[PDB]
Amino acid sequence: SHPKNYGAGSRVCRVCGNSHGLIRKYGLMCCRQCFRSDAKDIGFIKYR
Amino acid sequence: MADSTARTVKDVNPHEFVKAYSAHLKRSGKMELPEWVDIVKTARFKELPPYDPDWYYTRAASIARKIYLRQGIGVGGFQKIYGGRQRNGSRPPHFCKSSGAISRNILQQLQKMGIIDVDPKGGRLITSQGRRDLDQVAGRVDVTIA
Amino acid sequence: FKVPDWFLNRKKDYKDGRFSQVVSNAVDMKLRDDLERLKKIRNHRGLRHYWGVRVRGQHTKTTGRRGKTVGVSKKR
């Protein structure tokens, strides 16, 4: 029913359907801007 | 000169120490090359028919001097210092270095001689006999430096 | 060093003789012939040689004064 497969390469997140994407945050780096505003990374707490 | 023998190993200018020390290595029974050389041993130019004045004895001498002070240093430490092997812009290319076989082979000859022993994870270690060989020769070197 | 042809004689034209490190006149002569090999088999590399456009995937976005002919005014 299915055919032939082979097609490893750049995985891709759930959050972005985009070739480039992040392991760190589970985001994209445009999605990341939202998270940057939120802080979200430990030892970081806004307003820089 | 006799008083000088211990201290001089350190306090002398390294470049001219290597030039002096290399002559002493000509005396040694080793200096075995076994035909590893032929394809292109080193950077560009220095495939090793020119090696007898230019390259070989000074290569051996530099390794010998360094191991004394810096002791516990293995093959990978030697490769980088003599080498460049920095990432090119792809437009640059200049030389392409080697050094992995080269360092291994010379260090092996020194081990046969009894200069070097192998720390099991710490790299190559200078022996007591190796230190004696370095320091005794260095006595003679002091005269021209000073 | 040496340099010696090998493989079953079956294949008609060329082979490569094993990266010519014989050198002097012989390598220079073979250099011209090597382009003809690619043309003869009818590889895309040979089609590119035939056209006069440089083969080995350079940018061509601009630059092509080298690539097939010199700087001639406009375009198309």
Add this chain to the structure above:
Amino acid sequence: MAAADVAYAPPMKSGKIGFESSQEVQHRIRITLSSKSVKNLEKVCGDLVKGAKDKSLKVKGPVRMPTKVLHITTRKSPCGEGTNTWDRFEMRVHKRVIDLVSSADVVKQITSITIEPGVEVEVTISDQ
């Protein structure tokens, strides 16, 4: 001149192991209490409380060695659609603060976990 036969030999205690005795002779001390918090003020406060516990126990152990900064530091203009200026500087500093004790008794272990002053400080009783 000469003559040294060495090991450690004059008896025990190192900066690695805070030697103590009883408990079938205690040769077990090496606990690391590692404090990872969002806010530095809370993190520092936690360390002070740990020092108090050590003093109470039997033997007061050494104070914090607060170690290093770890940075994931991001400037990306998220998109303009052709923007090459005016990015935004959100940088993450993070510190891991390590307090060793002179004696990690069974008593020390239980008190540290049960009353733990961390609100957003996560401080870990942790492996050899």
Add this chain to the structure above:
Amino acid sequence: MGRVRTKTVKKTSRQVIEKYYSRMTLDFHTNKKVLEEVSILPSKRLRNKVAGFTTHLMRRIQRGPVRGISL
């Protein structure tokens, strides 16, 4: 450039002097201590700024009346 007094500094400097005056001095170092007693200022540089400005004013007062300071 740089070193002009702000409105926040101007209001505070007059007020401290007015109702602390006998204790206040021409001396910079002691009047730094006074600002700890009279207010909490969060950073170091704020304390030094106010202390310096007030002492300059204290000199002027003891050499002729100052426009907005009455003791």
Add this chain to the structure above:
Amino acid sequence: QVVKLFNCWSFEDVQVNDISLADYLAVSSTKHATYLPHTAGRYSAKRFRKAQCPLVERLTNSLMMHGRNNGKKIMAVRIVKHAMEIIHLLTDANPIQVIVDAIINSGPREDATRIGSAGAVRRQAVDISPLRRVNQAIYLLTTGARESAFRNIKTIAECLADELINAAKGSSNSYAIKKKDEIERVAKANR
């Protein structure tokens, strides 16, 4: 004491004949002058005195830049060190004196700045406050030295050295002295 400046040359042996030039070439610093590599806030005050001077320090820094690309302070010190001994042995006189002589000769009185005003471009000349004279003389010397080096077997230290002696003699063989009188000629005439 055995004061340095390459540990071969004194600098209080330099007598600066032009009195006005002497005051703006400081040959003595707070303990005495020397050449050692350092750093130095020289600001950008004008009119009046505006910096302390070491002749060698000014020389090395100008060489590092002008005659473009590559160079370093350490590289520039190296060529200067070589050049000074060459000059010293060719004049049989302290080489610091020779450069001071060169600077005063090769320092024009007046300039020929490009200012466009109304319907024409006038050069009426503008100031050349004396540190600017020092820099300008060396700059002209450097471009001359560079030209020779490019297509001929001569090290830049030697190229510079020859011109320096020539400039300190009014000899138009030097690039710098030739250009000094070029600027003045146009500036004065077209007033």
Add this chain to the structure above:
Amino acid sequence: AVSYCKPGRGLIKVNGVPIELIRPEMLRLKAFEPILLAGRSRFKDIDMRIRVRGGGKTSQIYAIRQAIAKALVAYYQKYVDEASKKEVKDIFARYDRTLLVADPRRCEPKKFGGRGARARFQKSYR
């Protein structure tokens, strides 16, 4: 015994100096100082204060300056040597000050922001 370290500071990189006032050696990294930096005007910076001073045998300096390039190395050692002897002698107060010491700069490498090709030198267009 005798080993007193007075921290100068001035440019990146820090020299921890155990100094004993005695015999006239200069060392850094357990090797003689002018030979270490041979053929350099910057070696003479270090040598400046054990020449100009009139004092030779007054410092056996052992110096270790650790971890960043060979170029930096000279400067720090000079300053420490002045200060150590200054504690003893009240006449060599005018020796530390007047032979010039102490600039950290306070402008030690600045931040790189976007738009910069290097950090402060903006791109060739934009």
Add this chain to the structure above:
Amino acid sequence: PPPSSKPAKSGGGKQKKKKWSKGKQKEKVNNSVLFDKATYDKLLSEVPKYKQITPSVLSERLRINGSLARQAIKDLESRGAIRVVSVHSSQLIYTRATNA
């Protein structure tokens, strides 16, 4: 250095070609003309006579032979006391007339 021409479409600009070769040297040094008399009497002695000490590199330009030609010659002469050579990192040195 001189500037350049200008571009054209096809073209590229150069403008300068150099002074051009003379002083091939080392070949000439080995053969008898320069090995015997010519270098010692004509070239080597006379430039230091004019100005008592002269650097090698200035003299190279005047005589119009390369440096390496006299590299060997300077060593032979210096032993005699005819020349005084020095040192330098960039290998610069002197030709000197007489000691005394």
Add this chain to the structure above:
Amino acid sequence: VSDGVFYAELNEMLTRELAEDGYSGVEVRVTPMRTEIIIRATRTQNVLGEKGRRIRELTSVVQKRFNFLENGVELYAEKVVNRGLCAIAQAESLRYKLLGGLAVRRACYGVLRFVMESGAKGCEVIVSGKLRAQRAKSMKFKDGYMISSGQPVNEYIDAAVRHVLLRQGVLGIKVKIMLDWDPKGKLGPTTPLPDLVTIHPPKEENEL
């Protein structure tokens, strides 16, 4: 570094769950081997409701997704210690007027009509443009102070979002509040803090 990634994933759990969510906020403190996970809502009663099934559905799911140990966890009801500071209800209440309608402008005013009531000192409510389905031209309303951006870190800023889907046009929102500091006293308005003493016949005098 790796620990920082782990922390970020824990925060992500709150973001997904408390996306839409018609209650109000969730601070979380993590005690040994259990998560306290505290809901800070008026209608914290409905979401729990005790025993049932409801409470177990909330917990279990989160654990299998992301945390450690086949065990239970904890869930706590809380009041609100000023509804200003942080919420989710603050945005949702405005949405619950942009249902059945009433003037959009009037609804904006009503949110502010609260907030200042519970202290605040300044408030800015800002409601998405496109009144009468025209082009966007966002409308303010503000009384007092209010610093989202400018002055110090510790302004205590409420911020949210939401959307209201009409036939013709979206009406966004972003309720914003600059309130007090954490109720216990620790007030510090706008970073430099002036203060005097009372009156100078001294031998006693000191204050702050």
Add this chain to the structure above:
RNA sequence: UUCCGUUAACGAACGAGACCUCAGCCUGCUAACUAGCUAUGCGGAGCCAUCCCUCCGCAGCUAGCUUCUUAGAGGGACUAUGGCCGUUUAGGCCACGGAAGUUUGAGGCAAUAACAGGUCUGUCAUGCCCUUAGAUGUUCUGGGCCGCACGCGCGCUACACUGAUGUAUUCAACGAGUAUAUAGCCUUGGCCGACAGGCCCGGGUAAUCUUGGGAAAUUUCAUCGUGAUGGGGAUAGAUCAUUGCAAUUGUUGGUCUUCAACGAGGAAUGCCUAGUAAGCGCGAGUCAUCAGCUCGCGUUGACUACGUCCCUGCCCUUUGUACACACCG
């Protein structure tokens, strides 16, 4: 709109300044073998051969040690002081102290309101419209963006001897190692390979191990000799490895061979005012593989101005306006 003062206006709020972040100065404060330095021994090396001297170990111990490192909490600058100038004020200029006199230096916040700026291709945010089994869904296979007679921008590399080549010197900083499967993500060490690379062990989800981040510029001893030069490294062909099932319009790297234009760039035009210009490397990001890129970081480091508004953009007055679609009027 920083302030004083005149003062039909008084007193506020917003922006900015302030603040926040980050770089400075402290054998101060508090600590630390998961960071160091000393002191002490020193098994260990060398020399006087003899104590000693000198070197050596991220342990040989100790420390009453914290200078660096690390990070918490402080104080430190307020143009202090003195003198000039000024309504004798707000101030500005200089001298001295001082680490710093300059909003402390450098960044971040940077508004009300405006723009039919840009993004429906960040998002199961979304109105409306279409489409929707012969899909504009989705999945699979293959190709594209790489196409080139030529215009433009960001860039890269040069024209050389302040340089290339070849030995030689041999020293880091900001960061980061996701279970990734049978050691796999970073990889030291040992073999083997000229290279690229392979292989076997081991440590490390990390102040520890990788990493003294032993990096490049630079630095030194030769070669060269001013030559389209061996500078430059183009285009091309063969061959071998690495990643991927697969490498082609050569993914990338190397080897062999080819040995370009370029001899300092015009009309024009950008950026820059002492840790900045220029040269120089690196890590992180995208990532199976691919960086001439970006974003930070170290390193080497100025000539010239510290003035003015000519050029240029905008702000406050007065003045003009037939403009308001606002001079592209």
Add this chain to the structure above:
RNA sequence: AAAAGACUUCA
């Protein structure tokens, strides 16, 4: 100071 001119519709 004389080198400065044009410039679609809904608007």
